[PDB]
Design an enzyme around this catalytic site. Sequence first.
Site, PDB file in Angstrom:
ATOM      1  N   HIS B  40     -11.509  -0.216   4.515  1.00 63.89           N
ATOM      2  CA  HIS B  40     -11.096  -0.542   3.153  1.00 63.89           C
ATOM      3  C   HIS B  40     -10.216  -1.784   3.073  1.00 63.89           C
ATOM      4  O   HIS B  40      -9.825  -2.176   1.965  1.00 63.89           O
ATOM      5  CB  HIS B  40     -10.410   0.661   2.493  1.00 63.89           C
ATOM      6  CG  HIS B  40      -9.051   0.985   3.036  1.00 63.89           C
ATOM      7  ND1 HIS B  40      -8.842   2.003   3.942  1.00 63.89           N
ATOM      8  CD2 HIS B  40      -7.832   0.453   2.781  1.00 63.89           C
ATOM      9  CE1 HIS B  40      -7.553   2.086   4.220  1.00 63.89           C
ATOM     10  NE2 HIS B  40      -6.919   1.153   3.533  1.00 63.89           N
ATOM     11  N   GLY B 142       1.458   0.651   3.522  1.00 62.78           N
ATOM     12  CA  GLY B 142       1.285  -0.319   4.578  1.00 62.78           C
ATOM     13  C   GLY B 142       1.069   0.263   5.951  1.00 62.78           C
ATOM     14  O   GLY B 142       0.992  -0.496   6.922  1.00 62.78           O
ATOM     15  N   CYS B 144      -1.638   2.095   6.857  1.00 64.21           N
ATOM     16  CA  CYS B 144      -3.033   2.279   7.233  1.00 64.21           C
ATOM     17  C   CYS B 144      -3.344   1.493   8.500  1.00 64.21           C
ATOM     18  O   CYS B 144      -2.822   0.396   8.725  1.00 64.21           O
ATOM     19  CB  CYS B 144      -3.957   1.874   6.086  1.00 64.21           C
ATOM     20  SG  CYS B 144      -4.006   3.154   4.822  1.00 64.21           S
TER      21      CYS B 144
HETATM   22  C1  LIG Z   1      -2.953   2.579   3.526  1.00 67.86           C
HETATM   23  O1  LIG Z   1      -1.807   1.905   3.951  1.00 67.86           O
HETATM   24  C2  LIG Z   1      -3.775   1.632   2.619  1.00 67.86           C
HETATM   25  O2  LIG Z   1      -4.382   0.524   3.299  1.00 67.86           O
HETATM   26  C3  LIG Z   1      -2.490   3.791   2.656  1.00 67.86           C
HETATM   27  C4  LIG Z   1      -1.546   4.751   3.355  1.00 67.86           C
HETATM   28  C5  LIG Z   1      -0.876   5.715   2.359  1.00 67.86           C
HETATM   29  C6  LIG Z   1       0.010   5.105   1.258  1.00 67.86           C
HETATM   30  C7  LIG Z   1       1.328   5.897   1.263  1.00 67.86           C
HETATM   31  N1  LIG Z   1       1.221   6.749   2.446  1.00 67.86           N
HETATM   32  C8  LIG Z   1       0.026   6.711   3.099  1.00 67.86           C
HETATM   33  O3  LIG Z   1      -0.269   7.345   4.093  1.00 67.86           O
HETATM   34  N2  LIG Z   1      -3.696   4.455   2.151  1.00 67.86           N
HETATM   35  C9  LIG Z   1      -4.085   4.542   0.851  1.00 67.86           C
HETATM   36  O4  LIG Z   1      -3.430   4.058  -0.068  1.00 67.86           O
HETATM   37  C10 LIG Z   1      -5.446   5.295   0.662  1.00 67.86           C
HETATM   38  C11 LIG Z   1      -6.503   4.174   0.408  1.00 67.86           C
HETATM   39  C12 LIG Z   1      -7.930   4.712   0.395  1.00 67.86           C
HETATM   40  C13 LIG Z   1      -8.381   5.156   1.778  1.00 67.86           C
HETATM   41  C14 LIG Z   1      -8.870   3.628  -0.128  1.00 67.86           C
HETATM   42  N3  LIG Z   1      -5.455   6.177  -0.482  1.00 67.86           N
HETATM   43  C15 LIG Z   1      -4.603   7.221  -0.565  1.00 67.86           C
HETATM   44  O5  LIG Z   1      -3.790   7.483   0.306  1.00 67.86           O
HETATM   45  C16 LIG Z   1      -4.670   8.011  -1.797  1.00 67.86           C
HETATM   46  C17 LIG Z   1      -5.226   7.736  -3.034  1.00 67.86           C
HETATM   47  C18 LIG Z   1      -4.856   8.815  -3.877  1.00 67.86           C
HETATM   48  C19 LIG Z   1      -5.178   9.131  -5.206  1.00 67.86           C
HETATM   49  O6  LIG Z   1      -6.000   8.228  -5.806  1.00 67.86           O
HETATM   50  C20 LIG Z   1      -5.936   8.242  -7.177  1.00 67.86           C
HETATM   51  C21 LIG Z   1      -4.647  10.284  -5.774  1.00 67.86           C
HETATM   52  C22 LIG Z   1      -3.795  11.126  -5.025  1.00 67.86           C
HETATM   53  C23 LIG Z   1      -3.461  10.846  -3.713  1.00 67.86           C
HETATM   54  C24 LIG Z   1      -4.001   9.677  -3.150  1.00 67.86           C
HETATM   55  N4  LIG Z   1      -3.867   9.128  -1.902  1.00 67.86           N
END
Ligand SMILES: *[C@@](O)(CO)[C@H](C[C@@H]1CCNC1=O)NC(=O)[C@H](CC(C)C)NC(=O)c1cc2c(OC)cccc2[nH]1
Lengths: 303, 304
Positions: B40, B142, B144
Amino acid sequence: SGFRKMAFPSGKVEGCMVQVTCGTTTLNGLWLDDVVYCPRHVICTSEDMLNPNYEDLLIRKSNHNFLVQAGNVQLRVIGHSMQNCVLKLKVDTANPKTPKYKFVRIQPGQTFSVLACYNGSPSGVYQCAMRPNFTIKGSFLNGSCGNVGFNIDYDCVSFCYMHHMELPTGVHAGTDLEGNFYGPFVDRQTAQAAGTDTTITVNVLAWLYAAVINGDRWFLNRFTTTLNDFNLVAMKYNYEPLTQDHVDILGPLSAQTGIAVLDMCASLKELLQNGMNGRTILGSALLEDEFTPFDVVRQCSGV
Amino acid sequence: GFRKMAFPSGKVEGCMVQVTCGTTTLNGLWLDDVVYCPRHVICTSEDMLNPNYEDLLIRKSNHNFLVQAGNVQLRVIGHSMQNCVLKLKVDTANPKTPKYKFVRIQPGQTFSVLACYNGSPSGVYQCAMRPNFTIKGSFLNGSCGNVGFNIDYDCVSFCYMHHMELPTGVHAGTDLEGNFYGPFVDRQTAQAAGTDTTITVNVLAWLYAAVINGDRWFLNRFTTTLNDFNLVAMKYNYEPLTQDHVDILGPLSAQTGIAVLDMCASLKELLQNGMNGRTILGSALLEDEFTPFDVVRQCSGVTF
Ligand SMILES: *[C@@](O)(CO)[C@H](C[C@@H]1CCNC1=O)NC(=O)[C@H](CC(C)C)NC(=O)c1cc2c(OC)cccc2[nH]1
Ligand SMILES: *[C@@](O)(CO)[C@H](C[C@@H]1CCNC1=O)NC(=O)[C@H](CC(C)C)NC(=O)c1cc2c(OC)cccc2[nH]1
């Protein structure tokens, strides 16, 4: 979000771990520049260790009495001195992996990371706190003498602990990198007791804030307390008194959650008087006191 | 002393990089001349709501990817997608590459996580994979691309790369081949995990660790069959044991002389009757995030 006991990344320290042997006694040393730091009792035989006259034992040693091994390389000792309980071995070779570093003396209640290491080989890393009675609740086994504790700020490693001793109760004692013990302990083969320990109140409060930040509020209440009245109850339960500085350090956590510090104190007082029933906080059944306010802010800022 | 211990992180620290596409940045893992990261990274924020990753990737070229070791750019010279992981071939082989393996772990298995932001490691902690394929980690914006790993001998076995935080505050991700653990997808949506259970093999390991330390009040006089134990355990929301679970308890069984099924019978009594106000290893809580290897490790000082 989430909250976990977290150590600093250990690589900068791993590159400094070596093995030090004198006679049949072996432990770990710390190799910075052309100096290797290790506990001075490496010079003792089992017989010496009951009542070692260290200055007398050290003068009878020669440089060639010390085997220093850094992985598969032996380092030649070209000089030796001792600073309190720390032996300093000059070697003919500078460690190329020496990080930027300082030696500091930590205060009770502060946390640090320990690199567990055996025969100069790193095995694990974990976070500890210096107890109010200057012991550490660690996981040091045989051969762990010379393991070091540290914090990392930016790119600088601040070494604050060298491991020496396990007490009969299973807690641990050691020195700063200047060789001074934390607490009333001595590097001799005797059973030693510590002063009565107390609970690090400012850290319990930080951890309660972390629990709120992570969606745990069951222990909160609508009451407040004065600082003195809180301290009266805390001391009754063998908690350290909360100072105004401690209140101030907790400010950012109070702001983030909107819970005044003395409001949290009222929660903690109710928990001390009623217990937790059967409930848990951040998965614990006990009030945790080994997270500092900085430890909490570092994992919870922004959440 | 018995406490949770991470592996030394230096071998992994040397492999952390930052990967950016447009303004979207996360972490990646640099081994030899390949960088691994969550796919992503190629999404804008809005793309993440309902991404078609095959279509989004066709539009990308090697020159659209910024890979940095610290502030040093590593030119990308090839790219391909494998499940939910992007693989970027870079022009420099990492001189700090350790001996490594990619492994896919079982629920109950523990691993170390190197927390890392902007390609800069910030901490290390120990995680367990829950039976519902979440991990109770500590992950901020940040994070991921942070990885989970074990170290055996001098070989790093990578088992986890971070993608997602669930509504409940637990965490979800993939192995290093990009296959999610559990029924999660890499989309910006609220997703729920199955109901979790207690990791029985780890509770048993912890009871063996108690016995090794002389704390053995709970040893009862009964035994059980594996099948009867599994059926009762499920009634207490404990995971059933597998044959592999029985086998990895073997060394702790031999060390203490307590047969695995006798320990199961002891645990079963603890579940049916509770602790009766007693503790084990100083806890009224049965701990389930120490594996049999963690117990053997932190009781014998295995180094790496
Ligand atoms: C990565 O850093 C993004 O590159 C990020 C890590 C999380 C943010 C805060 N703590 C973490 O572990 N991941 C995300 O933001 C992922 C991105 C996806 C895989 C495209 N998404 C989520 O963590 C996510 C989205 C949602 C949501 O929607 C709407 C609703 C509820 C929870 C939720 N989590
Ligand atoms: C070092 O590895 C030795 O080089 C070692 C570390 C402990 C062993 C088990 N866990 C540890 O943390 N330290 C010692 O063996 C020290 C050595 C001194 C400083 C010379 N001694 C003790 O830890 C010690 C001795 C005694 C004792 O005697 C008599 C009685 C009771 C407890 C006790 N601890």
